[PDB]
Amino acid sequence: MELALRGGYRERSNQDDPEYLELAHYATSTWSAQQPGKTHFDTVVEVLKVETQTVAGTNYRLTLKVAESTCELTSTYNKDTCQANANAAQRTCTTVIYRNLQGEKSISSFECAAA
Questions:
Q1: DSSP SS3 for 25
Q2: List of residues 6+ apart from 79 with CB closer than 8 A
Q3: InterPro entries annotated for this entry?
Q4: For a surface tag, which of 53, 56, 71, 109 has the fewest beta carbons within 10 Å of its beta carbon?
Q5: Rounded (10°) CA dihedral 77, 78, 79, 82
Q6: Closest C-alpha among 61, 35, 32, 30 to residue 48
């Protein structure tokens, strides 16, 4: 379920590995679908920061610029057709995704800063 440690995150660049963006989309679409009053998926405008912690499994702490997409929640989310319009409100959000050895992912946290 989680990897619990104070400190010990290592900084990664968002070009260090293409999977960071994939993980960002997984977290953002999954979380947005559960929010009360939402009609559309939120999507990832940009990965702003990547930090990881590994013991056996790994925490990916991703800081993201997020905006509402035009893809309805009744549709299947698509990582690259569900882009936000430049005029859509943006927020900075931070998510911790824990992945165990089986590759099972758990969103430990997903929090957005007020605009």
A1: helix
A2: 22, 25
A3: Cystatin_dom, Cystatin_sf, Prot_inh_cystat_CS
A4: 56
A5: -90
A6: 61
Resolution given for this structure, in angstroms:
1.8
User: Is the distance from CB of 59 to CB of 97 less than 8 angstroms?
Assistant: yes
Q: Identify residue 43 by its one-letter amino acid code.
A: T
Sign of the torsion formed by the C-alpha atoms of 76, 68, 11 and 58: negative
Contacts of residue 22, defined as CB under 8 A and 6 or more positions apart, other chains included, come to: 79
Give the chain's domains with CATH numbers: 1-115 (3.10.450.10)
Give the Å distances, CA to CA, from 39 to 36, 74, 76, 98.
Answer: 9, 8, 13, 27
**114 vs 72: CA distance, rounded Å:** 23
- Residue burial 61-86, b: 16+ Cβ < 10 Å; e: rest: bbbbebbbbebeeeeebeeeebbbee
